[PDB]
Amino acid sequence: YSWGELLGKWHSNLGARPKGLSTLVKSGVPEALRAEVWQLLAGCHDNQAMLDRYRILITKDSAQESVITRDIHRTFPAHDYFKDTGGDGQESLYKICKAYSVYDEDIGYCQGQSFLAAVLLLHMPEEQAFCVLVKIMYDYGLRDLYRNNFEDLHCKFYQLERLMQEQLPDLHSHFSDLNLEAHMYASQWFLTLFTAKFPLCMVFHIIDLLLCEGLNIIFHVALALLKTSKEDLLQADFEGALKFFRVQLPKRYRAEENARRLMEQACNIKVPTKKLKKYEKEYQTMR
């Protein structure tokens, strides 16, 4: 089945996902089609109200200049589009982040959010990147992870640990012996959607899957990463395991072949909503 046939049908029934979308996203959106598909998946249709709002938000001043500026100078600094500090990429990135800090009047701009903005900007006009970023934060519930001094993120750490305990017991046993807990290695995984440390070709694939199947995909990729790395991690001590996550693990998905396979593995791995429910309740009652 093809993206050509699928988009043809999508465009003739705008408010409804056509069949076979999931199987196609699983293999990955062709780079060339991402601007269009991502905006379809997120329910962005060249909105005029949002365009006019954005043009006003980029004229307002933000409290988080310094947090944004800090993040921008370290967002994909080896990529040609973002390398130089006076460049059009960084400027556009600045406008997006500044517009989000004003748009979201409870959370504002969050540390590491510029990595996600950048991924979107690479594929679409600045302003469209803003709209998809707003969608991901609000509709896909990414901003809720930050809410309440990170309440729901902590819940999500518990869930991954219980999933690991059920699906990777040897690794869970070894992590238990080391007191290596999920909040030490998995915070950027959940908060930045891997865009904080992982390679562009890897994270583009992540955005494909997230926008289609929602935030639960992070569980799938986290577990696939842990599974493929089992033997490295099993021989690691405390400091080694963290150094492995922060430095060695990202380098392994720099190429399109290794990124494609990991997403395949992530999609074969089952994270039943029921089981997530179970663990969420377990956690909820604790506090």
UniProtKB/Swiss-Prot annotation:
It is found in: Cytoplasmic vesicle; Early endosome; Golgi apparatus. Residues 28-214 form the Rab-GAP TBC domain. Induction: Up-regulated in esophageal squamous cell carcinomas. Expression is strongly inhibited in the medial septum and hippocampus brain regions of some Alzheimer disease patients. GTP-hydrolysis activating protein (GAP) for small GTPase RAB22A, converting active RAB22A-GTP to the inactive form RAB22A-GDP. Plays a role in endocytosis and intracellular protein transport. Recruited by ANK2 to phosphatidylinositol 3-phosphate (PI3P)-positive early endosomes, where it inactivates RAB22A, and promotes polarized trafficking to the leading edge of the migrating cells. Part of the ANK2/RABGAP1L complex which is required for the polarized recycling of fibronectin receptor ITGA5 ITGB1 to the plasma membrane that enables continuous directional cell migration. It comes from the Eukaryota. The record marks 70 as: Arginine finger. This is Rab GTPase-activating protein 1-like. The record marks 111 as: Glutamine finger. It is linked to Leukemia, acute myelogenous: A subtype of acute leukemia, a cancer of the white blood cells. AML is a malignant disease of bone marrow characterized by maturational arrest of hematopoietic precursors at an early stage of development. Clonal expansion of myeloid blasts occurs in bone marrow, blood, and other tissue. Myelogenous leukemias develop from changes in cells that normally produce neutrophils, basophils, eosinophils and monocytes. A chromosomal aberration involving RABGAP1L has been found in bone marrow cells from a child with leukemia, acute myelogenous. Translocation der(Y)t(Y;1)(q12;q25). The breakpoint at 1q25 disrupts RABGAP1L. Interacts (via Rab-GAP TBC domain) with ANK2 (via death domain). The arginine and glutamine fingers are critical for the GTPase-activating mechanism, they pull out Rab's 'switch 2' glutamine and insert in Rab's active site. It comes from Homo sapiens.
